[PDB]
């Protein structure tokens, strides 16, 4: 039931939300820390609720501040989708207790409590995975809380402070202290606040919510060990100077803080000059297939292979790949491709697998155990079957030794299984190791003739020749750009060139032995490389006791780019 | 930055059956890589095409849950293995776990 409505205003965070980052004790020391905090002068979204989309995102960490006295604010629910498809948490903080239920609980519209049934929060899930309990002693004033989750660890910080009659957040500071830790360990992307409404009755509430971010702070400990001052490091150049000098006061003079760079915008890549198209039409259908004992092998290279058109050539169901994936064949670039085509019986398709044992496995076709490729088999009952009976396909039956990987037999002779020689006559202890396949249209499924094509790939050992046609990112110009050119990772500005690279140079370096002029493997063009502009930043300030005004200067940069 | 102990032992004597053991599955497809020490139990039809899968495993519709095949006649790398890993949280809070040191 929807019976709660909400309004939003906005405020500046001033400077609040500094919590003891660690469990240690220090005194009269200016320390530096990097962690999640609420940046100073942030943009807090005041919520005013009266009696709605209360699915407030959680992000990395949440700072929740309230000033009400009726204790009408109670509980905090966290989750990712808050439905019966993904696991969700059930933190329900009441007067003096806390309970957790984490599984795929579904959630309704208004997560409120009747007041005390949480049935309006969850209904059911598969045998719930986890249930936990814990017992705290929880209790004109401001109440501030900070919740965060790091590496599957939920930690809560709190502080109760007195405030006079005022309408906004005050000045000054207030350190926060830890209360509870627990390792839930999941993706929480949203959370929800909860209130008390007695049956119902009209309700009023107001609170402030802010989102944490990773930052670097400098904190000052007094002689008593209590935090009394803190300065950000990514707010103003004066703040950066304070962070660098590791002091809260900056004397009259000029100091150097950090450096500025032109962050490159996009990224680009390289691919070679391949324009040929691999001939998959001739292999997948030729109105005739070689026998299993003499399988047809074709080598494909120096062309672009489009494996998406394979489905349109043969009437099969799905691919069967071991070293790679069927959907990941258009990205990797291979040196050579091998295609082995034959026709076998219906039940012997199972023998076409790595490390197989059987007549076909060790007498007709053997595959190395480290096969990295695909196998496609599909029925051939409408072309390889005759009412009289097909007899043009034969398979070997007897062999002295098992077949070596990727080895075929073509020689035909009279196999001997006795002491006396065969002498060219198929008498006793003399056999013919070539059995003709029997294919009929009335045979069972396991006996129907099946066309089988095995594709074997070669990894990047030689300059590759077979891969998909994705442009070399349509070479950009006059922009600082990231790039991964042929395994070379870096950034740079790319411009035209006036240098005469000789016919077959790929990289050309400088005195520093770093590249300055370049070709393109997709189109023979000559280009120049420069470093993106960068420099240093200096800050000129008077004495801190005089004024807070500062001046910023970029060293050795024309006053046009900045 | 892993610090801890790993104990692995081949369990082909109990996780292999003559018919073939499919007790264990693995996820084959995922939109994004996994954060350290994170699992994934949610099961749905993975979509690899522009059109929605609509809960039917047709074209451009895959199952990101492939069953393992465990047999006692398979190779050593194909035999099932049982692994127990112990990881330690060092001294940041009041330590709770250690041996029987006399006070």
């Amino acid at each position, epitope marked *: 039931v929807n019976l709660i409505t909400r309004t939003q205003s906005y405020t500046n965070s001033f400077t609040r939300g500094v919590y003891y980052p660690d469990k240690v004790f220090r005194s009269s020391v200016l320390h530096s820390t990097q962690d999640l905090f609420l940046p100073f002068f942030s943009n807090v979204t005041w919520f005013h609720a009266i009696h709605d989309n209360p699915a407030l995102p959680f992000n990395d960490g949440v700072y929740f501040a309230s000033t009400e006295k009726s204790n009408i604010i109670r509980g905090w629910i966290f989750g990712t989708t808050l439905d019966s498809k993904t696991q969700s948490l059930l933190i329900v903080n009441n007067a003096t207790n806390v309970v957790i239920k984490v599984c795929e609980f579904q959630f309704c519209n208004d997560p409120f409590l009747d007041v005390e049934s949480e049935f309006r929060v969850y209904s*059911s899930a*598969n*045998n719930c995975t986890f249930e936990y309990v814990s017992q705290p002693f929880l209790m004109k004033n401001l109440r501030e809380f900070v919740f965060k989750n790091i590496d599957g660890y939920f930690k809560i910080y709190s502080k109760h402070t007195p405030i006079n009659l005022e309408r906004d957040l005050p000045q000054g500071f207030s350190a926060l202290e830890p209360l509870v830790d627990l390792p839930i360990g999941i993706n929480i992307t949203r959370f929800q606040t909860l209130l008390a409404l007695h049956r119902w009755t009209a309700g009023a509430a107001a609170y402030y919510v802010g989102y944490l971010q990773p930052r670097t702070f400098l904190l000052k400990y007094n002689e008593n060990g209590t935090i009394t001052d803190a300065v950000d490091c990514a707010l103003d150049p004066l703040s950066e100077t304070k962070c660098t000098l590791k002091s809260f006061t900056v004397e009259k003079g000029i100091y150097q803080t950090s450096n500025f760079r032109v962050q490159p915008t996009e990224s680009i890549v390289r691919f070679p000059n391949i324009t040929n198209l691999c001939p998959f039409h001739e292999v997948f259908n030729a109105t005739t297939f070689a026998s299993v004992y003499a399988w047809n092998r074709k080598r494909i290279s120096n062309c672009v292979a489009d494996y998406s058109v394979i489905y349109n050539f043969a009437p099969f*169901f*799905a691919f069967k790949c071991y070293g790679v994936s069927p959907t990941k064949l258009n990205d990797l670039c291979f040196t050579n491709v091998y295609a082995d085509s034959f026709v076998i019986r219906g039940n012997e398709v199972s023998q076409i697998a790595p490390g197989q044992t059987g007549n076909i496995a060790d007498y007709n076709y053997k595959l190395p155990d480290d096969f990295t490729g695909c196998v496609i088999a599909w029925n051939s009952n409408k072309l390889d079957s005759k009412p009289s009976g097909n007899y043009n396909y034969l398979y070997r039956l007897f062999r002295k030794s098992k077949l070596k990987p990727f080895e075929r037999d073509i020689s035909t002779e009279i196999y001997q299984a006795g002491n006396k020689p065969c002498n060219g006559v198929a008498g006793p202890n003399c056999y013919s190791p070539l059995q003709s396949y029997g294919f009929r249209p009335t045979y069972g499924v396991g006996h129907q003739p099946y066309r089988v094509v095995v594709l074997s790939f070669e990894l990047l050992h030689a300059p590759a020749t077979v891969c998909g046609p994705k442009k070399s990112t349509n070479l950009v110009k006059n922009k600082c750009v990231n790039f991964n050119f042929n395994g070379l990772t870096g950034t740079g500005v790319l411009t035209e060139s006036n240098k005469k690279f000789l016919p077959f140079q790929q990289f050309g370096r400088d005195i520093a032995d770093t590249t300055d002029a370049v070709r393109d493997p997709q189109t023979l063009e000559i280009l120049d490389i420069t470093p993106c502009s960068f420099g240093g930043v200096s800050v000129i300030t008077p004495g801190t006791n005089t004024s807070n005004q500062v001046a910023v200067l970029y060293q050795g940069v024309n006053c046009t780019e900045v | 930055d892993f610090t801890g102990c790993v104990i692995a032992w081949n369990s082909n004597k109990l996780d292999s059956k003559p018919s073939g053991n*499919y007790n264990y*599955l693995y996820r084959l497809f995922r939109k994004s890589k996994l954060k350290p020490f994170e699992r994934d*139990i949610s*099961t749905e*039809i*993975y979509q690899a095409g522009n059109k929605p899968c609509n*809960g039917v*495993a047709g074209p451009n*519709c*895959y*199952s990101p*849950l*492939q*069953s393992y095949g465990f047999r006692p006649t398979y190779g050593v790398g194909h035999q099932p293995y049982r692994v127990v890993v112990l990881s330690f949280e060092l001294l940041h809070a009041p330590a709770t776990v250690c041996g029987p040191k006399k006070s």
Partner: nanobody, 129 residues
Framework: QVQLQESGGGLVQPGGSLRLSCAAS????????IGWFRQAPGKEREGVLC????????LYADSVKGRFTISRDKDKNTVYLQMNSLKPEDTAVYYC??????????????????????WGKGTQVTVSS
């Protein structure tokens, strides 16, 4: 850890109604297709009906179509059936069973028939006739 216990049954006149349930305790498989079988004295055990675990894609048999109404409840992880209009040909020993789903062709397909991982103790359903 995984146990299948079955409750219900008895002897009723033809055309009567019966409710029989089998409860799965300790089940841990994410995808599964629990199977249901019956065996009269002197005949082989055959499948009866099943539905998908993910969404409840129902399936029946020709002999028991319409008469055998089934539903799966994930709260108790048990299977419930409504059986009405009993005939003497339904006199058999009914066993409840659970098995894992098939993963072939990169899809989720529920299969029954043989190849069942687990089975129940079974009961007796008798028609006076």
């Amino acid at each position: 850890q995984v146990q299948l216990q079955e409750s219900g049954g008895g002897l009723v006149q033809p055309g009567g109604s019966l409710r029989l349930s089998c409860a799965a305790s300790g089940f841990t498989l994410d995808d599964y297709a629990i199977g249901w079988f019956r065996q009269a004295p002197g005949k082989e055990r055959e499948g009866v009906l099943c539905i998908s675990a993910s969404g409840g894609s129902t399936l029946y048999a020709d002999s028991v179509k319409g008469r055998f109404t089934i539903s799966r409840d994930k709260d108790k992880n048990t299977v419930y059936l409504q059986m009405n209009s009993l005939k003497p040909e339904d006199t058999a020993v009914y066993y409840c069973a659970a098995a894992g789903r098939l993963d072939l062709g990169s899809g989720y397909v529920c299969y029954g028939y043989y190849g069942t991982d687990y089975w129940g103790k079974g009961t007796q359903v008798t028609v006076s006739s």
